[PDB]
């Protein structure tokens, strides 16, 4: 690059946008994530590095609630990730105010992806340094899960992972047999996969933030009860 | 906004020991017309706060949408906090005052009931931004008819029990149906308590017409 | 004019009159008041004809765009939300009574009412327009639960016919629209086919 | 900065590069005859996959104003759209003058939003304009930075130099009738590599009756007997 | 060539001999069609041995029921359906080569040229050419 | 310098930014083919799906812009979706402003004008996605057009875009030079065999997604697995 | 290094460099510690003095009765953040008569500071914030870095040589919930005293204390107010 990798408005000689090619590197460097579409819902999971024990119980959590039934598991530059989560919350609120009911996940993912692409198109603004999964469930549309790269577009995922170790997580994700496994065992298995991914081999101790959406929660994307999912973390440990 | 077309009639509510009960009939008065007889004028603000309104039902629906959206946004953050019914009453008060200042008033008189921190709260806000809290509240002709009974009950009994409170509310609804042109014999009664907000549904009051034989 | 909607099992039936009045002169005696907002969603207009047409066309815009961007037929509730927002934000300028109905696979036959003011309500049956105020008792007394397609069609046709014959601002022909999963079927009742309850007052 | 810019000491380097770009390769000759004006151009589509009745090089801006152009067709589209809007606005303001040739000079002058407000990047197309609503014809050229030139015969292609030389040697002249379109086709022939045909060559004529883009039938008729 | 997806070895074992009994004299073509459906299923599952066995069974049924014409259009359809598996068609041609050499007959010349046309579509050096050489020698 | 860094005219008299943006379409690893026929217009692009954890239901590159116009995108997917959204907005806005549905040529013209505005100025950049849109037009038969990151909107009968677009265009030029009209079987088979000869995988009926617009049947039919499988069986016969 | 020049540009190795430089603005500042308790939040800030004649400057800024902040870094765009937080808390007071919960305020600050990290020509707010608040969930201590990524913390310190204070707080953070007000304040004073070189020592004039509790609204204690806390120092410089 050298000369062409200064602003996103400058195309590469081969026809590439090196600003986003570098923004993807921040996502590749930040801690990983995972989201699996269970048979009747979607289960999230993210390891968060407790950089210092001075911090309280899990804060700046990689999980977010963008709408009543929709959750966002994000990785990458966390401040811009939170700003984008606020953008998604505003988009969901606006859609609910205008068209009523709840925003379908495919349309929400498409709109937030178009907003992210608007931020990577220009020169004055810079591409977002974050990649996130949007997971939701409803009785009508089942469970959906869309993943958005820092510059790419939403894609339907049965199971997806992002962050430091995408391939290592995805191998065991594809090893796992989804589409017939209930969200409970999927919660056990996502923690198992995260613990299989390196946590303290080169880093500090990690916390297990896991999220729910499904008919077992009648929609209503909420963080899994951590007190009762500590045993799921224990099964992951074994 | 400027001239309501479909108006909702009176709503009332009283607080008791450990909870509050409000009641609104299910009639949307298109002037002198009983156009809509199966509409709910009571909204669940959250798990521990209820709200009813009297007046333009379109304005009530707009306020319901906005307030539900802001409650959803508040609960999305997952900070453990919530919009206390006192805060909700203040927010509605400010909204009505801002609309009046902009000279686009919201043709609704609203009663906000809640039970948080183990203490019952029962707010009141009108179109002109006048707000306060009282143990018993009523709107429109309800404040003329049902309110005196509540005041005379509360003067001798500063505190109330839930069963006799809802019986008193039912009697006040009967009185309002008897002597209000815009009233209807189908009212919803919503009770807020420590367990949450429970709405009974299309309750009806029994009418007495023995005095009809006193015409001659 | 009079507009009316009824919801039955698996679809809805809409009936509207063809008269639009200006003062005491008949501007258009064959007015088509059943505007198709989408393939399976229809609109019944009452009041200011220009305002009704503008609101219906803008909502048809937004709803078609929204359906295309979802790759799925829109909900009748979504259309009614669009109408309520459009009417409520501009109620002080726009004075129009709108009856919305249609069929979607999510719920089925649905009917909503958005009169002047901008309020939305879901009803088993909806009635509006200048001539509506004359058939309230009949429509309420002669409506059953679980009525089939033909029963709803005939009952709505009768209600529109009586509203026409009684109200001075209503007349001409009757337009019926049956909306279901199979599609929409629109028919016109004219002249002798109008269900008539003759009033032969004795001399 | 956000206008026509980049003018060093005694030069307009960006404008000169724009003129190097408008050298193009579409000859697009124009001839001002006594009866009217002919704007002929070459449509040499890559392969037979492309279509010739789909896109056009000659555009009627109004009733008797016709337009042909040079390199940077995408810029030319926006320019002709702007020209149509400008002519329509003038006709609306000064209602019903049937304004073509008392407007051809005026529309050429209002081709100042064309370049004098370049838009960061100047337009890369030079366009020839024809009009005949004055009892006399008019052929004007507007370039990526200049203004109306009021030509009598010129070309704006890859071989525009020898095309103009051919025009003057073949004596564009003044007594030439409307059928100087034969000479225009001959001038294209010099800057053409192929057996030119009706779809390969697009020509519009603007006489005192009005402007008309000649259909492939008449273009082939003229190309016959050449 | 391509990885096997769904094997039907149990299905062909339990059904193919029963199909042979049901059409011992080959009067039924529904049996041929249903094994065509089964081998199509195994082909979409990318199984070679099952398809080869089905084709070998089909030609063996045609041998025993001596329908020479129906053999000709049957093998034409088998070789031209989607080209199937190159191993399977090369097999089927091989047992066809083994069969045409034992019955003298008049139209075995037609059988020889039919298989020649089926194999001359290409794939000569690849997937068996000695069969085509032997057929040409047989024609000689 | 910065002649090759910003959207400014080169000293040699060229525009290098759009020249790079066109190669951006080749980047991404995909190809698409569009064939206009006697009465229909069919388009097909490969569906490169890495790993099955993705949803093949939503990985598509073809969309409905309106009830009769269907597009296929080639290039970066984010810009592709942005331009698809813009095209849908333009179609809806045209239907609102003018009663009749937007002709496909006019829609391509508007998209090309937007792209030309993008290559104008310097604050923004061109979108690296080439769009091929087809649709039935009355008094015109089937119509196919291509809008490019530059603003040049054209293309007809047989037109392709993607990495190996040149080979597909050459084969389609051979086919169209062979003077025989394609019915609503020959057009589809021609497109399928073109894309297969470009990329020989024999095209298992799951890795391509074909869109069809006929005249007797309007609308952009995104042909299902069964239809593409039937066409593939008929072709390989 | 080219890629380190501007905030908008992104480094090829990953994260951008201007924000990483922005965190050096808070590193180059006087030390400050802030710790939670079961019922109180206490901030101990080192009031850095220019010269003995001049005052020790102002730290531990006041926001509301239940929220108080401590700045560490670029003082210019720090009173701006103080104004923003005061305005938001007063807006909450005005709209629904309740103290704005600290978590929502911190989220607002993070969102507000995130935009300059992406808008060209806008430097990030290189200010380190130690927000002490008492919402309904007990005391809270939050650290806001110029990278706009806030953190919640049982006890956190920022400033020059603040790593030693961080280590002391971590080693003594187990015995933080069950501490009297004076005990916790003395914990913070020992943590801050361990930051400066051995020549420096705590004085009534060079230290500031911010205490907020359940019944105690936020109060900024200094020399005379600090002396009762400064007693029993257990001085081991």
Swiss-Prot record, chain A:
Listed GO CC annotations: cytoplasm; cytosol; extracellular exosome; nucleoplasm; nucleus; proteasome complex; proteasome core complex; proteasome core complex, alpha-subunit complex
Induction behaviour: Down-regulated by antioxidants BO-653 and probucol. Up-regulated by bacterial lipopolysaccharides (LPS) and TNF.
Pfam families: Proteasome (PF00227), Proteasome_A_N (PF10584)
Residues bearing the modification N6-acetyllysine: 53, 202, 226
GO biological process, one term: proteasome-mediated ubiquitin-dependent protein catabolic process
UniProt KW keywords: Acetylation, Cytoplasm, Host-virus interaction, Nucleus, Phosphoprotein, Proteasome
Single GO MF descriptor: ubiquitin protein ligase binding
Compartments where found: Cytoplasm; Nucleus
Subunit structure: The 26S proteasome consists of a 20S proteasome core and two 19S regulatory subunits. The 20S proteasome core is a barrel-shaped complex made of 28 subunits that are arranged in four stacked rings. The two outer rings are each formed by seven alpha subunits, and the two inner rings are formed by seven beta subunits. The proteolytic activity is exerted by three beta-subunits PSMB5, PSMB6 and PSMB7. Interacts with AURKB. Interacts with CDKN1A. Interacts with MDM2 and RB1. Interacts with the C-terminus of TBXA2R isoform 2. Interacts with DNAJB2. (Microbial infection) Interacts with HIV-1 Tat protein.
Family assignment from sequence similarity: Belongs to the peptidase T1A family.
Record-given protein name: Proteasome subunit alpha type-3
Gene, per the UniProt record: PSMA3
UniProtKB/Swiss-Prot annotation, chain D:
Protein name: Proteasome subunit alpha type-2
Keywords: Acetylation, Cytoplasm, Nucleus, Phosphoprotein, Proteasome
A single cellular component GO annotation: extracellular exosome
SUPFAM superfamilies associated with the record: N-terminal nucleophile aminohydrolases (Ntn hydrolases)
Protein's UniProt keywords contain Cytoplasm: yes
Pfam families reported for this sequence: Proteasome, Proteasome_A_N
Provenance organism: Homo sapiens (Human)
Disulfide bonds: none
Function description: Component of the 20S core proteasome complex involved in the proteolytic degradation of most intracellular proteins. This complex plays numerous essential roles within the cell by associating with different regulatory particles. Associated with two 19S regulatory particles, forms the 26S proteasome and thus participates in the ATP-dependent degradation of ubiquitinated proteins.
Modified residues (Phosphotyrosine): 17, 69, 114
PROSITE patterns for this protein: PROTEASOME_ALPHA_1 (PS00388), PROTEASOME_ALPHA_2 (PS51475)
Database matches in Gene3D superfamilies: Glutamine Phosphoribosylpyrophosphate, subunit 1, domain 1 (3.60.20.10)
Result when mutating residue 103 to V: In a colorectal cancer sample; somatic mutation
Chief location category: cytoplasm
Modified residues (N6-acetyllysine): 63, 164
Modified residues (Phosphoserine): 7, 9
Localisation: Cytoplasm; Nucleus
The keyword Amino-acid biosynthesis is assigned to this record: no
One of the protein's GO biological processes: proteasome-mediated ubiquitin-dependent protein catabolic process
Family of this protein: Belongs to the peptidase T1A family.
Record lineage: Eukaryota, Metazoa, Chordata, Craniata, Vertebrata
Upregulation: Down-regulated by antioxidants BO-653 and probucol. Down-regulated in response to enterovirus 71 (EV71) infection (at protein level).
Post-translational modification: Phosphorylated on tyrosine residues; which may be important for nuclear import.
From Swiss-Prot, chain F:
Modified residues (N6-acetyllysine): 95, 97
Phosphoserine modified-residue sites: 10, 56-57
Gene Ontology annotations of biological process type: positive regulation of canonical NF-kappaB signal transduction; proteasome-mediated ubiquitin-dependent protein catabolic process; proteolysis involved in protein catabolic process; regulation of inflammatory response
Coiled coil feature spans: none
Entry's Gene Ontology cellular component terms: cilium; cytoplasm; cytosol; extracellular exosome; mitochondrion; myofibril; nuclear matrix; nucleoplasm
GO molecular function, one term: NF-kappaB binding
Main location: cytoplasm
Modified residues (Phosphotyrosine): 152
Annotated compartments: Cytoplasm; Nucleus
Keywords, comma-separated and alphabetical: Acetylation, Cytoplasm, Glycoprotein, Nucleus, Phosphoprotein, Proteasome
Function of the protein: Component of the 20S core proteasome complex involved in the proteolytic degradation of most intracellular proteins. This complex plays numerous essential roles within the cell by associating with different regulatory particles. Associated with two 19S regulatory particles, forms the 26S proteasome and thus participates in the ATP-dependent degradation of ubiquitinated proteins.
Cited NCBIfam families: PRK03996.1 (NF003075)
Similarity remark: Belongs to the peptidase T1A family.
Protein name stated in the entry: Proteasome subunit alpha type-6
Lineage: Eukaryota, Metazoa, Chordata, Craniata, Vertebrata
Swiss-Prot record, chain G:
Record CDD domains: proteasome_alpha_type_1 (cd03749)
InterPro entries in UniProt: Ntn_hydrolases_N, Proteasome_alpha, Proteasome_alpha-type, Proteasome_alpha1, Proteasome_asu_N, Proteasome_sua/b
Recorded superkingdom: Eukaryota
Keyword annotations from UniProtKB, A to Z: Acetylation, Cytoplasm, Glycoprotein, Immunity, Isopeptide bond, Nucleus, Phosphoprotein, Proteasome, Ubl conjugation
Gene3D superfamilies in alphabetical order: Glutamine Phosphoribosylpyrophosphate, subunit 1, domain 1 (3.60.20.10)
Keyword check for Kinase: no
GO MF term set: lipopolysaccharide binding
Coiled-coil stretches noted in the UniProt entry, renumbered to this chain: none
Pfam name, any one: Proteasome_A_N
Phosphoserine: residues carrying this PTM: 107, 174
Transmembrane segments: none
SUPFAM superfamilies registered for this protein in UniProt: N-terminal nucleophile aminohydrolases (Ntn hydrolases) (SSF56235)
Single GO cellular component term: proteasome core complex, alpha-subunit complex
GO biological process: immune system process; negative regulation of inflammatory response to antigenic stimulus; proteasome-mediated ubiquitin-dependent protein catabolic process
Glycosylation sites: 107
Up-regulation conditions: Induced in breast cancer tissue (at protein level). Up-regulated in liver tumor tissues.
Cross-link for Glycyl lysine isopeptide (Lys-Gly) (interchain with G-Cter in ubiquitin), residue positions: 112, 205
The protein's role, per its UniProt record: Component of the 20S core proteasome complex involved in the proteolytic degradation of most intracellular proteins. This complex plays numerous essential roles within the cell by associating with different regulatory particles. Associated with two 19S regulatory particles, forms the 26S proteasome and thus participates in the ATP-dependent degradation of ubiquitinated proteins.
PANTHER family: PROTEASOME SUBUNIT ALPHA/BETA
Descriptive protein name: Proteasome subunit alpha type-1
């Amino acid at each position: 690059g050298t000369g062409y990798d200064l602003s996103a408005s400058t195309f590469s000689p081969d026809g590439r946008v090196f600003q986003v090619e570098y923004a993807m590197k921040a996502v590749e460097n930040s801690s990983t994530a995972i989201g699996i579409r269970c048979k009747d819902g979607v289960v999230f999971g993210v390891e968060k590095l407790v950089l210092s024990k001075l911090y309280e119980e899990g804060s700046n959590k990689r999980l977010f609630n963008v709408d009543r039934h929709v959750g966002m598991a994000v990785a990458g530059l966390l401040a811009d990730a939170r700003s984008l989560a606020d953008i998604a919350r505003e988009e969901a609120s606006n859609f609910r105010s205008n068209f009523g009911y709840n925003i379908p996940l495919k349309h929400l993912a498409d709109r937030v992806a178009m907003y992210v692409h608007a931020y990577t198109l220009y020169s004055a603004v810079r591409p977002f340094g974050c990649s996130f999964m949007l997971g939701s469930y409803s009785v009508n549309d089942g469970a959906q899960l869309y993943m958005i790269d820092p510059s790419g577009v939403s894609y339907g995922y049965w199971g997806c992972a992002i962050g430091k170790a995408r391939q290592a997580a995805k191998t065991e994700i594809e090893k796992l047999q989804m589409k017939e496994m209930t969200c409970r065992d999927i919660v056990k298995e996502v923690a198992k996969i995260i613990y299989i991914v390196h946590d303290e081999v080169k880093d500090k101790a990690f916390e297990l933030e896991l999220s729910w959406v499904g008919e077992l929660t009648n929609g209503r994307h909420e963080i899994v009860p951590k007190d009762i999912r500590e045993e799921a973390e224990k099964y992951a440990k074994e | 906004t400027q001239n309501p077309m479909v108006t909702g009639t009176s709503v009332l509510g009283v607080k008791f020991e450990g909870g509050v009960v409000i009641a609104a009939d299910m009639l949307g008065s298109y002037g002198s017309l009983a156009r809509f007889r199966n509409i709910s004028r009571i909204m669940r603000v959250n798990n521990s706060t209820m709200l009813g309104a009297s007046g333009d039902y379109a304005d009530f629906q707009y306020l319901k949408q906005v307030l539900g959206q802001m409650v959803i946004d508040e609960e999305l953050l997952g900070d453990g906090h919530s919009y206390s019914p006192r805060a909700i009453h203040s927010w509605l008060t400010r909204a009505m005052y801002s609309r009046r200042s902009k000279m686009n008033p919201l043709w609704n008189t609203m009663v906000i009931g809640g039970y948080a921190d183990g203490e019952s709260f029962l707010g009141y806000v009108d179109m002109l931004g006048v707000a306060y809290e009282a143990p018993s509240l009523a709107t429109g002709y309800g404040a003329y008819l049902a309110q005196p009974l509540l005041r005379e009950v509360l003067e001798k009994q500063p505190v109330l029990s839930q069963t006799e409170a809802r019986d008193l509310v039912e009697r006040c609804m009967r009185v309002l149906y008897y002597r209000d042109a815009r009233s209807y014999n189908r009212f919803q009664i919503a009770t807020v308590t420590e367990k949450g907000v429970e709405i009974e549904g299309p309750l009806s009051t029994e009418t007495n017409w023995d005095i009809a034989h006193m015409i001659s | 004019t009079t507009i009316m909607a009824v919801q039955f099992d698996g679809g809805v039936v809409l009936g509207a009159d063809s008269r639009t009045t200006t003062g005491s002169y008949i501007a258009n005696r064959v007015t088509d008041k059943l505007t198709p907002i989408h393939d399976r969603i229809f609109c019944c207009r009452s009041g200011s004809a220009a305002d009704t047409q503008a609101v219906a066309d803008a909502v048809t815009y937004q709803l078609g765009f929204h359906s295309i961007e979802l790759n799925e037929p829109p909900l009748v509730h979504t259309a009614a939300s669009l109408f309520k927002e459009m009417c409520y934000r501009y109620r002080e300028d726009l004075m129009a009574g709108i009856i919305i109905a249609g069929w979607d696979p999510q719920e089925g036959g649905q009917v909503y009412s958005v009169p002047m003011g901008g309020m939305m309500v879901r009803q088993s049956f909806a009635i509006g327009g200048s001539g509506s105020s004359y058939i309230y008792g009949y429509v309420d007394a002669t409506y059953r639960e679980g009525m089939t397609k033909e029963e709803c069609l005939q009952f709505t046709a009768n209600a529109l016919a009586l509203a026409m014959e009684r109200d001075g601002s209503s007349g001409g022909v009757i337009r019926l629209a049956a909306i279901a999963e199979s599609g929409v079927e629109r028919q016109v009742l004219l002249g002798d086919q109008i269900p008539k309850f003759a009033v032969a007052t004795l001399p | 900065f956000s206008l026509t810019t980049f003018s060093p000491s005694g030069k307009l380097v960006q404008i000169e590069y724009a003129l190097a770009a408008v050298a193009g390769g579409a000859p697009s000759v124009g001839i001002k005859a006594a009866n009217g004006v002919v704007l002929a151009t070459e449509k040499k589509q890559k392969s037979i996959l492309y279509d010739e009745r789909s896109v056009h090089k000659v555009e009627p801006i109004t009733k008797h104003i016709g337009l042909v152009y040079s390199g940077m067709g995408p810029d030319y589209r926006v320019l002709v759209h702007r020209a149509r809007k400008l002519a329509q606005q003038y006709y609306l303001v000064y209602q019903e003058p049937i304004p073509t040739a008392q407007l051809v000079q005026r529309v050429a002058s209002v081709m100042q939003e064309y370049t004098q407000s370049g838009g960061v990047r100047p337009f890369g197309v030079s366009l020839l304009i024809c009009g005949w609503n004055e009892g006399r014809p008019y052929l004007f050229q507007s370039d990526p930075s200049g203004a109306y030139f009021a030509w009598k015969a010129t070309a704006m292609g890859k071989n525009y130099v020898n095309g103009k030389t051919f025009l003057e040697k073949r004596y564009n002249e003044d007594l030439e009738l409307e059928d100087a379109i034969h000479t225009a086709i001959l001038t294209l022939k010099e800057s053409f590599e192929g057996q030119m045909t009706e779809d390969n060559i697009e020509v519009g004529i603007c006489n005192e009756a009005g402007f008309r883009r000649l259909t492939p039938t008449e273009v082939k008729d003229y190309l016959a007997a050449i | 060539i391509v990885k096997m997806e769904v094997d039907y070895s149990a299905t062909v074992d339990q059904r193919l001999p029963e199909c042979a009994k049901l059409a011992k004299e080959g009067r039924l073509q529904e049996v041929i069609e249903t094994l065509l459906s089964l081998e199509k299923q195994t082909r979409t599952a990318s199984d070679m041995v099952s398809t080869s066995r089905i084709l070998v069974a089909v030609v063996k049924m045609c041998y025993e029921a001596k329908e020479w014409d129906l053999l000709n259009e049957n093998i034409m359809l088998l070789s031209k359906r989607r080209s199937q598996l190159k191993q399977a068609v090369a097999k089927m041609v091989q047992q066809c080569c083994t069969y045409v050499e034992e019955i003298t007959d008049l139209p075995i010349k037609l059988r020889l040229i039919d298989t020649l046309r089926m194999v001359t579509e290409g794939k000569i050096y690849v997937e068996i050419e000695r069969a085509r050489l032997t057929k040409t020698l047989a024609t000689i | 310098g910065f002649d090759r860094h910003i959207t400014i005219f080169s000293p040699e008299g060229r525009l290098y930014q759009v020249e790079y943006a066109f190669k951006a379409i080749n980047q991404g690893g995909l190809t698409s083919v569009a064939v206009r026929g006697k009465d229909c217009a069919v388009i097909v692009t490969q569906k490169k799906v890495p790993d099955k954890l993705l949803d093949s239901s939503t990985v598509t590159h073809l969309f409905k812009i309106t009830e009769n116009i269907g597009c296929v995108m080639t290039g970066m997917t984010a810009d592709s979706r942005s331009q698809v959204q813009r095209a849908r907005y333009e179609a809806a806005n045209w239907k609102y402003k003018y009663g009749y549905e937007i002709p496909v040529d006019m829609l391509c013209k508007r998209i090309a004008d937007i792209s030309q505005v993008y290559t104008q100025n310097a604050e923004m950049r061109p979108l690296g996605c080439c769009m091929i849109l087809i649709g039935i037009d009355e008094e015109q038969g089937p119509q196919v057009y291509k809008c490019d990151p530059a603003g040049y909107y054209c293309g007809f009968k047989a037109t392709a875009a993607g990495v190996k677009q040149t080979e597909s265009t050459s084969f389609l030029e051979k086919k169209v030079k062979k003077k025989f009209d394609w019915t609503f079987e020959q057009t589809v088979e021609t497109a399928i065999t073109c894309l297969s000869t470009v990329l020989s995988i024999d095209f298992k009926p799951s890795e391509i997604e074909v869109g069809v617009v006929t005249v007797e049947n309007p609308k952009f039919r995104i042909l299902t697995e069964a239809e593409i499988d039937a066409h593939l069986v008929a072709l390989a016969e | 290094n080219q890629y380190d020049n501007d905030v908008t540009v992104w480094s090829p190795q990953g994260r951008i460099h201007q924000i990483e430089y922005a965190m050096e603005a808070v590193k180059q500042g006087s030390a400050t510690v802030g710790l939670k308790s079961k019922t109180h939040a206490v901030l101990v800030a080192l009031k850095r003095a220019q010269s003995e004649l001049a005052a020790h400057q102002k730290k531990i800024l006041h926001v509301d009765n239940h929220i108080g902040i401590s700045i560490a870094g670029l003082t210019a765009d720090a009173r701006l953040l103080c104004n923003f937080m005061r305005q938001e808390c007063l807006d909450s007071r005005f709209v629904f008569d309740r103290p704005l919960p600290v978590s929502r305020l911190v989220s607002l600050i993070g969102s507000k500071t995130q935009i300059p990290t992406q808008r060209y020509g806008r430097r990030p707010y290189g200010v380190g914030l130690l927000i002490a608040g008492y919402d309904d969930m007990g005391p809270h201590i939050f650290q806001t870095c110029p990278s706009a990524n806030y953190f919640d913390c049982r006890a956190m310190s920022i400033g020059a040589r603040s790593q030693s204070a961080r280590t002391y707080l971590e080693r003594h953070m187990s015995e933080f919930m069950e501490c009297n007000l004076n005990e916790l304040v003395k914990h913070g004073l020992r943590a801050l005293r361990e930051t400066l070189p051995a020549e420096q020592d705590l004085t009534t004039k060079n230290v500031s204390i911010g205490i907020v509790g359940k019944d105690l609204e936020f109060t900024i204690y200094d020399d005379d107010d600090v002396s009762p806390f400064l007693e029993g120092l257990e001085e081991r410089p």
